[PDB]
Amino acid sequence: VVGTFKAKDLIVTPATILKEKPDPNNLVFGTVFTDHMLTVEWSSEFGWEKPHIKPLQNLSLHPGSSALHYAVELFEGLKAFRGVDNKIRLFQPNLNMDRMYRSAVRATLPVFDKEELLECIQQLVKLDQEWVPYSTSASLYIRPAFIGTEPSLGVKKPTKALLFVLLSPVGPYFSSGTFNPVSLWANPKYVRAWKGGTGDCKMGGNYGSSLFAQCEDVDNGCQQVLWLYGRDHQITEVGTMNLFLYWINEDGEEELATPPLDGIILPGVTRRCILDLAHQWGEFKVSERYLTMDDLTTALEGNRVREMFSSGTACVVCPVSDILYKGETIHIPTMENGPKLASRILSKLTDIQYGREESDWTIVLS
Amino acid sequence: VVGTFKAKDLIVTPATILKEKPDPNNLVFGTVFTDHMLTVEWSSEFGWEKPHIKPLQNLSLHPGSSALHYAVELFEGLKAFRGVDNKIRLFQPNLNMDRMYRSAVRATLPVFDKEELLECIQQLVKLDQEWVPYSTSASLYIRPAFIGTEPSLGVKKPTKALLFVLLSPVGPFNPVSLWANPKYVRAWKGGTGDCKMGGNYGSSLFAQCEDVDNGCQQVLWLYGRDHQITEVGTMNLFLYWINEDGEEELATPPLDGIILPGVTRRCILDLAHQWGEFKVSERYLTMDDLTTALEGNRVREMFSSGTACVVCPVSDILYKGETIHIPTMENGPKLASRILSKLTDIQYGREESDWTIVL
Ligand SMILES: O=C(NNS(=O)(=O)c1ccccc1C(F)(F)F)c1cc2cc(Cl)ccc2o1
Ligand SMILES: O=C(NNS(=O)(=O)c1ccccc1C(F)(F)F)c1cc2cc(Cl)ccc2o1
Ligand SMILES: *Cc1c(COP(=O)(O)O)cnc(C)c1O
Ligand SMILES: *Cc1c(COP(=O)(O)O)cnc(C)c1O
């Protein structure tokens, strides 16, 4: 009956015991959780139930829940930042609501009002706002999660669902003053996503398949997987991050390149922001364009590569120093070239996030 | 540290209040559950905990559990059958243990002893014996499920996992129409399509809804530039036809990475090989192969195979705005019904085969 839950209807149950906050200089990503969570029930029969902010607790799930059997699930990732002026800000959160809604449609999970969800998240962050780290390098990670809770074993659109939101303090990925570059494991035997698949959505199924390649990656002394696609060996994504290459292209032009949104690339918020920034600066060519391993190695051979970095919410920007490919270690001169652009981008994005630069990209906490 | 759980140290906690069994005449597939369940806990620090048979209950899961975020999960599907002689039988259950083990490796979930799990399952079915329907048209569906319960949001190999088993009384030609849209691809080479990992299935619900929107019951999964016909929903695809050489042939797509190696598929192949009445070919089949054969009146039957239906005749394919009729039902379907009869006879103990194990 009810098309969406409403922030107006929020039922809040404060915790009676409050946990001590962690040292912001000693945070490991996604391991410590705050006092409270958002939960909202849905059923086909009654529609959306009233949303609850309540103490962080285990989920009680029928063991037949479709999220556990057929990966009927999706997530988001966005952050709250305590500013230089001690104001807490969200960064481009409407883009995450847009993406989550679209992933829900693709998953066949129930549709919701994006502004109502945004306001419920605002209220949850406001309640746990002291968990937003008092550090200009740490932030509060927000994990909205949407699962099918259909008890029956038929492979079908769920008639029961749970939307929930977790909060987790996260620290810097740089340390001792500098970036921590990654080595990438490039094995064309694995594919992250395919044309006709769901790689342009944040559905859980895209990620469970990537764990094997990641373990093999770690066994070979690499931190992330470089995801290759097709007979041409297109470079697509770095782990769970978008791929950027800053180089002199085939025409001899200084260029920032990233793979196009042709269905196998997750449309990152960070990725969009970087494209926007680089276009605005107007200092070099910006291309959404295919990039192969042969393109890369040829350019490296002729000293045309400047930097390679990955982009995502957790780290904003992550420089790439090495790629393990066909039994060889190929060096990327990212760190030797500054990294000039990667550092410039990180500074710009963090300025905005922490309120050093006024931009419409941020929103002050409700 | 503990490499496997063992059926030896099974802890059995029977329910004090038992539920009434459903009418075996009106069962809805996976909607009704028995009194008990198996659960086995794992962690990287201590290895496999002791297994438990206990009352069916909700799972208490950390909201960060990787099964909920990154689909760190797999399942199996197999059945128990109350024979004509009242003996309860499992059917090729070691093949399900083999496949579950493969799926866990690909998923990075902890490995276990296959013989130990089968025995834990046998003890579970044994406890809940009376739930195996008193009907030769019904069976007990067995659902082993294996999930990551790692509380942290980092995308990595789980340090926490839960293995559980559910039991569900299920009942019972009604041919299906297939919706064929090449813009959805079920599986890719370098993917996980040959495992029963949950991630393979979440991505399929949109296509199935679209299928229903158009009066079709299942999706025909197409692959590649040549539009290879691969699987029928959650079933393997069989084509009974006269091939291009003018030979009568049973054909099915080969196991090149994008096809789930079905148990039913295996059994049908074994049987058709044994009979030696027609050619048996694991080979590529395209939409053009099929439409060309249909024009020349060379197609006899098309059916899917899986544990839930055993065999499912196909009457129509909707592809590129066309309605392509398959003469399955106008040809008996004799092969489909022969297979259904054969497997049913073995499953319900009407004939002996090493494929069945008495509980
Ligand atoms: O930003 C990163 N990931 N992108 S993300 O933030 O949007 C994301 C996407 C999908 C799943 C999980 C994640 C997250 F949160 F990183 F865990 C990321 C991964 C990563 C791995 C290393 Cl080793 C270093 C820096 C890193 O940053
Ligand atoms: O046997 C079937 N599916 N194969 S299955 O049995 O191994 C299976 C595989 C993956 C997920 C779920 C299932 C199951 F159990 F059907 F739900 C099946 C699907 C199906 C759909 C229709 Cl419309 C009619 C008969 C049918 O039988
Ligand atoms: C989330 C994600 C991205 C990065 O997206 P952001 O919105 O910038 O955090 C890129 N690739 C994959 C596979 C992702 O899951
Ligand atoms: C399980 C399944 C099959 C059928 O396999 P059986 O072992 O015969 O039940 C076929 N295709 C897919 C995608 C499946 O998951």
CSV table of N, CA, C and O in Angstrom, one decimal, chain A residues 78-83 87-91 121-122 125-126 129 131-133 135 138-142 167-170 313 353-354 363 365:
chain,number,residue,atom,x,y,z
A,78,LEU,N,29.3,5.9,1.0
A,78,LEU,CA,29.5,7.4,1.0
A,78,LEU,C,30.0,7.8,2.4
A,78,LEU,O,30.0,7.0,3.3
A,79,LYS,N,30.4,9.1,2.5
A,79,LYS,CA,31.1,9.5,3.7
A,79,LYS,C,30.5,10.8,4.3
A,79,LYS,O,30.1,11.7,3.6
A,80,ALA,N,30.7,10.9,5.7
A,80,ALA,CA,30.4,12.2,6.4
A,80,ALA,C,31.8,12.7,6.8
A,80,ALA,O,32.7,11.9,7.3
A,81,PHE,N,32.0,14.0,6.7
A,81,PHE,CA,33.3,14.7,7.0
A,81,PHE,C,33.1,15.8,8.0
A,81,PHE,O,32.3,16.7,7.8
A,82,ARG,N,33.8,15.8,9.1
A,82,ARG,CA,33.9,16.9,10.0
A,82,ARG,C,34.8,18.0,9.5
A,82,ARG,O,36.0,17.7,9.4
A,83,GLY,N,34.3,19.1,9.2
A,83,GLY,CA,35.0,20.2,8.5
A,83,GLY,C,36.0,20.9,9.3
A,83,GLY,O,36.1,20.8,10.5
A,87,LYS,N,31.9,21.7,11.1
A,87,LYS,CA,30.6,21.4,10.5
A,87,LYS,C,30.7,20.0,9.8
A,87,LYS,O,31.7,19.8,9.1
A,88,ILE,N,29.8,19.2,10.0
A,88,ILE,CA,29.7,17.9,9.4
A,88,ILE,C,29.1,18.0,8.0
A,88,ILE,O,28.0,18.6,7.9
A,89,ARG,N,29.7,17.4,7.0
A,89,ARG,CA,29.2,17.5,5.6
A,89,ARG,C,29.1,16.1,5.0
A,89,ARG,O,29.9,15.2,5.2
A,90,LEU,N,28.1,15.9,4.1
A,90,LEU,CA,28.0,14.8,3.2
A,90,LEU,C,28.5,15.3,1.9
A,90,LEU,O,28.4,16.5,1.6
A,91,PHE,N,29.0,14.4,1.1
A,91,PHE,CA,29.6,14.7,-0.2
A,91,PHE,C,28.8,14.0,-1.3
A,91,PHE,O,28.8,12.8,-1.4
A,121,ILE,N,19.2,8.8,6.7
A,121,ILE,CA,20.7,8.7,6.8
A,121,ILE,C,21.2,10.0,7.6
A,121,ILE,O,22.0,9.8,8.5
A,122,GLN,N,20.8,11.1,7.2
A,122,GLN,CA,21.1,12.4,7.9
A,122,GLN,C,20.8,12.3,9.4
A,122,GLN,O,21.7,12.6,10.2
A,125,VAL,N,23.3,9.8,11.1
A,125,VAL,CA,24.6,10.4,11.2
A,125,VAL,C,24.5,11.5,12.3
A,125,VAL,O,25.4,11.6,13.1
A,126,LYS,N,23.4,12.3,12.3
A,126,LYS,CA,23.3,13.3,13.4
A,126,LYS,C,23.3,12.7,14.8
A,126,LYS,O,23.9,13.2,15.7
A,129,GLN,N,26.8,11.5,15.4
A,129,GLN,CA,27.7,12.5,14.9
A,129,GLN,C,29.1,12.6,15.6
A,129,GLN,O,30.1,12.9,14.9
A,131,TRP,N,30.8,10.2,16.3
A,131,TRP,CA,31.6,9.2,15.7
A,131,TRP,C,32.3,9.6,14.4
A,131,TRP,O,33.2,9.0,13.9
A,132,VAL,N,31.9,10.7,13.8
A,132,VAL,CA,32.6,11.4,12.7
A,132,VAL,C,33.9,11.9,13.3
A,132,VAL,O,33.9,12.7,14.2
A,133,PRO,N,35.0,11.3,12.9
A,133,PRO,CA,36.3,11.6,13.5
A,133,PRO,C,36.8,13.0,13.6
A,133,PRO,O,36.6,13.8,12.7
A,135,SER,N,39.4,14.6,13.1
A,135,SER,CA,40.7,14.4,12.3
A,135,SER,C,40.4,14.9,10.9
A,135,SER,O,39.3,14.6,10.3
A,138,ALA,N,40.6,11.5,8.7
A,138,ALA,CA,39.6,10.4,8.9
A,138,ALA,C,38.2,10.9,8.7
A,138,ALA,O,37.9,12.1,8.7
A,139,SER,N,37.3,9.9,8.4
A,139,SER,CA,35.9,10.3,8.1
A,139,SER,C,35.0,9.1,8.6
A,139,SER,O,35.5,8.1,9.1
A,140,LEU,N,33.7,9.3,8.5
A,140,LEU,CA,32.7,8.3,8.9
A,140,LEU,C,32.1,7.7,7.6
A,140,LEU,O,31.4,8.3,6.8
A,141,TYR,N,32.4,6.4,7.4
A,141,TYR,CA,31.9,5.7,6.2
A,141,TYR,C,30.4,5.2,6.5
A,141,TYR,O,30.1,4.8,7.6
A,142,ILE,N,29.6,5.5,5.5
A,142,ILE,CA,28.2,5.2,5.5
A,142,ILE,C,27.9,4.0,4.6
A,142,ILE,O,28.2,4.1,3.4
A,167,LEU,N,27.2,2.5,10.1
A,167,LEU,CA,28.2,3.6,10.1
A,167,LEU,C,29.5,3.1,10.7
A,167,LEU,O,29.5,2.3,11.6
A,168,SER,N,30.6,3.5,10.1
A,168,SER,CA,31.9,3.0,10.5
A,168,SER,C,33.0,4.0,10.2
A,168,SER,O,33.2,4.5,9.1
A,169,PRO,N,33.8,4.4,11.3
A,169,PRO,CA,34.9,5.3,11.2
A,169,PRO,C,36.0,4.7,10.3
A,169,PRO,O,36.4,3.6,10.5
A,170,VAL,N,36.5,5.5,9.4
A,170,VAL,CA,37.6,5.1,8.5
A,170,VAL,C,38.7,6.1,8.5
A,170,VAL,O,38.4,7.3,8.6
A,313,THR,N,35.4,5.8,-3.1
A,313,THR,CA,35.1,6.5,-1.9
A,313,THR,C,36.0,6.3,-0.7
A,313,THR,O,36.4,7.3,-0.1
A,353,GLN,N,35.6,18.3,0.6
A,353,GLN,CA,35.0,17.4,1.6
A,353,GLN,C,35.0,18.0,3.0
A,353,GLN,O,34.0,17.9,3.8
A,354,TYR,N,36.1,18.6,3.4
A,354,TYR,CA,36.4,19.1,4.7
A,354,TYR,C,36.0,20.6,4.9
A,354,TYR,O,36.3,21.2,5.9
A,363,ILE,N,27.0,19.0,1.4
A,363,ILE,CA,25.7,19.4,2.1
A,363,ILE,C,26.0,19.3,3.6
A,363,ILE,O,26.6,18.3,4.0
A,365,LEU,N,25.1,18.7,7.5
A,365,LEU,CA,24.3,17.8,8.2
A,365,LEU,C,22.9,18.4,8.6
A,365,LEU,O,22.9,19.6,9.1
